[PDB]
Amino acid sequence: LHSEIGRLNNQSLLWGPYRPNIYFGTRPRIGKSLMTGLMWGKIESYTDFQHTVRYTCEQNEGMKGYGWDEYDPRRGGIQSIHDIQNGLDITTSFVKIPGGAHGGSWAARIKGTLNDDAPKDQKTIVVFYVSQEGENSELEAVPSENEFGYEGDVILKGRSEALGNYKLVVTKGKGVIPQSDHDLSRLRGPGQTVVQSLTYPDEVLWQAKPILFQQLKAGIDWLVENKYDVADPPPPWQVYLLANKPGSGNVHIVQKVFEGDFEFDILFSSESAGKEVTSKDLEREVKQATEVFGERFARVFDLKAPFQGDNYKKFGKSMFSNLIGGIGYFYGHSLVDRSYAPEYDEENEGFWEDAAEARARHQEALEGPYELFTSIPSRPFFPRGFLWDEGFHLLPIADWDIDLALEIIKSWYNLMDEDGWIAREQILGAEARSKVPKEFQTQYPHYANPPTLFLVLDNFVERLRKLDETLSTASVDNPEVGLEYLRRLYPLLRRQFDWFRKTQAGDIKSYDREAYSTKEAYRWRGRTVSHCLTSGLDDYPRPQPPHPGELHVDLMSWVGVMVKSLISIGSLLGATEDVEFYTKVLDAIEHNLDDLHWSEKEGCYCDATIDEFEEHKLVCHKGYISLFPFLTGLLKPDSPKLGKLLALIGDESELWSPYGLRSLSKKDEFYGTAENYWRSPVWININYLAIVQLYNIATQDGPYKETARDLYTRLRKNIVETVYRNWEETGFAWEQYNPETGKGQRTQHFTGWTSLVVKIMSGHH
Ligand SMILES: O=[N+]([O-])c1cc(-n2ccnn2)ccc1NCCCCCCN[C@H]1C[C@](O)(CO)[C@@H](O)[C@H](O)[C@H]1O
Numbered sequence: 001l002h003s004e005i006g007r008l009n010n011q012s013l014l015w016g017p018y019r020p021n022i023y024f025g026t027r028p029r030i031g032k033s034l035m036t037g038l039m040w041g042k043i044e045s046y047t048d049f050q051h052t053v054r055y056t057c058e059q060n061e062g063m064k065g066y067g068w069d070e071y072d073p074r075r076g077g078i079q080s081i082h083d084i085q086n087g088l089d090i091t092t093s094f095v096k097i098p099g100g101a102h103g104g105s106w107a108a109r110i111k112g113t114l115n116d117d118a119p120k121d122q123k124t125i126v127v128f129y130v131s132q133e134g135e136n137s138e139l140e141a142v143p144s145e146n147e148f149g150y151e152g153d154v155i156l157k158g159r160s161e162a163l164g165n166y167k168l169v170v171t172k173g174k175g176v177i178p179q180s181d182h183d184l185s186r187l188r189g190p191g192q193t194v195v196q197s198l199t200y201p202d203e204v205l206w207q208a209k210p211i212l213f214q215q216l217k218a219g220i221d222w223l224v225e226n227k228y229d230v231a232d233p234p235p236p237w238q239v240y241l242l243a244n245k246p247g248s249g250n251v252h253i254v255q256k257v258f259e260g261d262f263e264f265d266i267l268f269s270s271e272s273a274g275k276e277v278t279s280k281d282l283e284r285e286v287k288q289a290t291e292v293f294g295e296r297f298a299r300v301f302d303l304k305a306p307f308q309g310d311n312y313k314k315f316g317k318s319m320f321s322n323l324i325g326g327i328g329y330f331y332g333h334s335l336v337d338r339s340y341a342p343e344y345d346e347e348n349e350g351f352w353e354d355a356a357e358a359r360a361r362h363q364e365a366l367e368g369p370y371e372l373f374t375s376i377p378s379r380p381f382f383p384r385g386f387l388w389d390e391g392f393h394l395l396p397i398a399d400w401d402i403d404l405a406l407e408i409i410k411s412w413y414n415l416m417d418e419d420g421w422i423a424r425e426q427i428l429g430a431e432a433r434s435k436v437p438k439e440f441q442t443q444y445p446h447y448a449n450p451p452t453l454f455l456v457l458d459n460f461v462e463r464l465r466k467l468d469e470t471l472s473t474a475s476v477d478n479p480e481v482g483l484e485y486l487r488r489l490y491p492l493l494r495r496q497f498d499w500f501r502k503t504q505a506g507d508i509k510s511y512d513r514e515a516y517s518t519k520e521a522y523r524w525r526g527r528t529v530s531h532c533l534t535s536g537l538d539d540y541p542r543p544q545p546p547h548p549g550e551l552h553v554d555l556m557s558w559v560g561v562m563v564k565s566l567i568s569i570g571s572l573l574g575a576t577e578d579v580e581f582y583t584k585v586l587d588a589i590e591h592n593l594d595d596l597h598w599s600e601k602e603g604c605y606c607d608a609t610i611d612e613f614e615e616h617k618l619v620c621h622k623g624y625i626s627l628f629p630f631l632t633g634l635l636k637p638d639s640p641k642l643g644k645l646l647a648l649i650g651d652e653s654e655l656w657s658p659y660g661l662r663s664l665s666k667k668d669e670f671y672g673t674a675e676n677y678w679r680s681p682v683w684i685n686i687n688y689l690a691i692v693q694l695y696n697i698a699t700q701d702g703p704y705k706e707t708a709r710d711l712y713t714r715l716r717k718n719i720v721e722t723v724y725r726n727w728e729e730t731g732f733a734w735e736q737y738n739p740e741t742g743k744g745q746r747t748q749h750f751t752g753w754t755s756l757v758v759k760i761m762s763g764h765h
């Protein structure tokens with residue numbers, strides 16, 4: 001039955017708008033296949049189009065906003081784009097129609113509305129770009145009757161092994177088509193939909209913009225050569241209308257020009273399914289998808305007081321739809337340094353200088369190809385997989401569709417190498433690389449990241465203990481299916497755990513360090529004087545100078561998180577020898593957190609170093625790091641230490657701002673210094689962990705129950721209201737929030753773990 005659910009899930013998830021790096025485009029979960037993309041831009045002059053045309057996601061003053069209003073990867077959804085520069089509001093509706101043997105069919109509606117400020121006779125160029133990678137695949141544009149282009153629909157017929165036979169149709173559409181009285185029309189027509197069918201080497205097919213512009217440039221070259229000059233120039237829009245030349249090839253450009261409002265459809269018909277998809281099919285299924293989305297949202301994300309209002313519901317729908325709408329399929333090679341240079345061991349004082357020398361050897365090479373199915377922090381700024389981010393992304397998604405989330409977790413673990421390493425940033429293929437400076441592409445096998453995907457697994461296990469709709473919860477509804485999933489994944493989880501202890505081990509034995517265990521101590525590799533990027537808390541102040549005898553309390557707490565998970569999963573699988581080993585490790589971490597990390601003088605947890613005199617020293621900077629054992633759920637609900645942490649969390653003069661918990665204390669000497677990234681701002685992922693642990697203490701009998709209940713109530717309200725207030729004013733979720741002004745700052749479109757706010761509102765953890 002597991003194999004059967006596997007196949008059904010594959011078929012359900014195959015097609016999507018799985019290119020979150022562009023405003024709108026589709027690809028299936030197949031490395032080398034058919035991809036589609038949308039471009040538009042106003043044309044007012046002979047030179048402006050190259051500046052106006054939209055393709056890849058950005059966020060600047062020329063773009064008011066964009067995002068998914070509704071989305072489910074099984075059914076599709078509706079996206080809204082508000083383009084100031086091009087004076088357009090665009091809607092892209094996408095819908096999936098199951099059937100046949102090849103992952104089903106789909107359709108899209110592209111609707112453009114001129115905004116109030118736009119000239120009522122604006123000319124807009126719109127391009128639908130289609131490409132196909134494959135050795136034995138074919139794609140052919142059926143030619144038009146008319147001399148110069150299409151009066152009606154453009155039909156592409158194609159075949160691949162993965163897709164079988166299919167037809168893709170770009171409809172004539174509704175909206176005024178501008179007409180030219182110029183002489184050029186004798187040779188190019190007066191104005192009509194055109195198609196160029198081209199071939200290029202497979203690996204450059206993703207470069208849609210440069211490919212389009214090269215065609216446009218050859219068009220203009222033709223004009224000059226054929227004596228169309230500045231004495232009497234054709235209109236700008238006609239200068240930029242490609243000459244019709246349809247045919248076979250691995251690239252097809254479908255170009256339309258519109259004056260005023262426009263709309264057109266894209267219909268993809270899997271031949272192996274029933275009758276071909278129609279426009280009428282599209283509208284019906286769109287209506288149906290919205291109805292289904294609304295129902296699931298009210299079940300899954302029941303927003304509790306004081307966020308029951310329609311304003312908060314809209315806010316929740318938007319935050320959630322953008323998070324789930326960010327899911328992408330990525331494929332290609334990665335840049336990895338596989339030297340394992342000895343300087344990367346970081347065993348000596350000054351190690352950061354030795355490590356940089358080794359990096360400057362530039363031994364990294366491309367490897368793979370790999371594929372990844374994942375959500376992403378930010379369409380415009382971070383459109384790729386981040387390891388510890390995904391743990392947070394999947395918490396809301398798992399509520400929506402555990403089978404989806406499990407699929408994504410599986411995607412991630414399928415990347416793990418023989419050592420147990422998964423690269424913390426997944427840049428797959430030349431397309432993904434185009435968005436990343438080369439210096440920052442290289443992944444290092446010694447660099448870890450928080451193993452937050454364990455948290456999602458914890459949620460899955462608890463649920464397991466306690467037709468799309470059916471598929472979405474198949475893995476919990478059929479307990480044998482869930483366990484089979486865990487059976488396969490469990491060895492990879494154990495491998496990663498072992499990798500942590502081999503590669504991120506700290507040094508107890510070689511110093512004057514008394515502690516309950518000689519094994520349990522941990523140190524993030526990859527730290528510079530000012531940074532520890534691998535920890536995820538980029539610039540949070542750590543011991544100075546960096547030192548091989550450092551110990552990091554957050555890393556140890558994550559190791560705690562992992563063992564707990566392996567205890568739960570091992571028990572389920574009856575790995576008795578395993579559970580006994582983990583149990584001892586959990587015991588050891590609990591004592592060693594106290595022995596090496598607890599500061600009585602300061603009343604919180606702390607990183608450690610080794611002195612100028614070779615003595616163990618705590619270095620305390622009060623902030624998220626100080627709370628880590630609490631945030632990770634390692635503290636007993638009656639613990640005196642917990643009490644002290646609750647005092648720190650609730651202290652206004654330290655961590656507690658009107659807008660949420662500051663990442664660093666106002667009293668810390670590093671507050672608001674340097675890049676001030678993790679040195680004061682409020683971060684929703686860490687606030688989310690606090691809220692969940694506060695709630696936990698609040699809903700059990702114990703001495704801190706009422707303290708936690710008060711803090712839970714207020715922190716939930718503070719965090720939700722902060723994100724909502726900014727969403728209301730700016731239309732954006734932000735990477736972080738200013739604790740003095742409440743203002744969102746840094747990266748826009750951070751959906752992104754900011755979207756956890758949907759889970760915070762719906763409560764009842
Ligand atoms: O380095 N580049 O890619 C880069 C590319 C371009 N650029 C623009 C156009 N083309 N290229 C410009 C600049 C940079 N430098 C920035 C590198 C520092 C890494 C950011 C800090 N990480 C944040 C966010 C997460 O990393 C992901 O949400 C969290 O995981 C983490 O916890 C969190 O602190």
Ligand SMILES: *[C@@H]1O[C@H](CO)[C@@H](O)[C@H](O)[C@H]1NC(C)=O
Pocket residue numbers: 010
């Ligand atoms: C799901 O995607 C395709 C469709 O069959 C296949 O190549 C892939 O391996 C499937 N997953 C597994 C592990 O079978």
